[model samples]
Target: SLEEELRRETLKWLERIEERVKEIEGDEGFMRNIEAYISDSRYFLEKGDLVRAFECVVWAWAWLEIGLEVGKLHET
Candidate 1:
């Protein structure tokens, strides 16, 4: 039950990050950083490493937040 919940939450964050990525795709630096973290997250998930996958997704989320604050990304 806990694993399933975590998986669902992780997927939600992943989806949000991806949607945001499309909006800020023009910013090469931010795109690269976020994309790298997303890639790592997916890799860890495929390997069944939940903790590392979560970490990567959080890192990706942090970058997205920073991008938003810095005007590299938009709220919409």
Candidate 2:
């Protein structure tokens, strides 16, 4: 289990985040944080730090989720 999670989430979140990224193109506030995490993850990923990279991706998605949950992200 030396990163069963890494392979799984790495692929999963890539497609997942790309799709959601388009969906939030018109939103504000949290979008910046969301975008930042994605970028941060890429930085860590290329350096072979899978755990931190995955965590950043997860944080990105979580920020997006919270924004949408609040309704302002997609608008009420």
Candidate 3:
């Protein structure tokens, strides 16, 4: 139950990140960076390493917020 809950929360974070990512779809470099972080997060999550997974999630959240803020600032 706890694992499922954590997974659900992780997915919610992912969905939020994905929304921001779609807003910056043309930036291949940005996407690559996010993809790497996401991949590592997924790896940690898959391993049931919740501590690392949380770390990855926090990093992803920060990245997504920065992307959305910059996207809005530039309107590009």
Candidate 4:
């Protein structure tokens, strides 16, 4: 059920962050951090580490939240 759970969580955060992600595309530091988290997720997923991958996605989502709040990313 790990795969199923990962799929569900991935979809959930993707939907939640998709628009905000696009809004921050021009921010180098933000993009770099997000890409690193995504890379970490992919590495863990490829290694069958579903929980870590899920955690990475969650961290990435949190970064987006912080970035928005700190004015590092767009609000709209």
Top-TM-score candidate index: 2
Q: What's the CA RMSD of model 2 in angstroms?
A: 2.3
TM-score-superior candidate, 2 or 4 = 2
- Roughly what TM-score does model 2 have, to 2 decimal places? 0.81
Write out the backbone clash pairs for model 2: none
Which pairs in model 1 have colliding backbones? none
Q: Summing lDDT over every window of 10 consecutive residues in candidate 3, give the lowest-scoring window.
A: 67-76
Q: How well does candidate 4 match the true structure in TM-score terms?
A: 0.69
lDDT, candidate 3, 2-76, per-residue tens: 877788887778667666655555455655767777777778888888667767877866665676677732224
State in Å the error of residue 64, model 4: 1.0
Off by over 4 Å in 2: 25-27
The most accurate candidate by lDDT is 1
Backbone collisions counted per model: 0, 0, 0, 0
Q: Comparing candidate 1 with candidate 2, which one achieves the higher TM-score?
A: 2
Cα RMSDs, all models:
2.1, 2.3, 3.3, 2.8
Estimate, for each residue in 10-29, the C-alpha lDDT of model 1 and write its tens digit. Answer: 78888887777776644568
Higher-ranked by lDDT: 1 or 4: 1
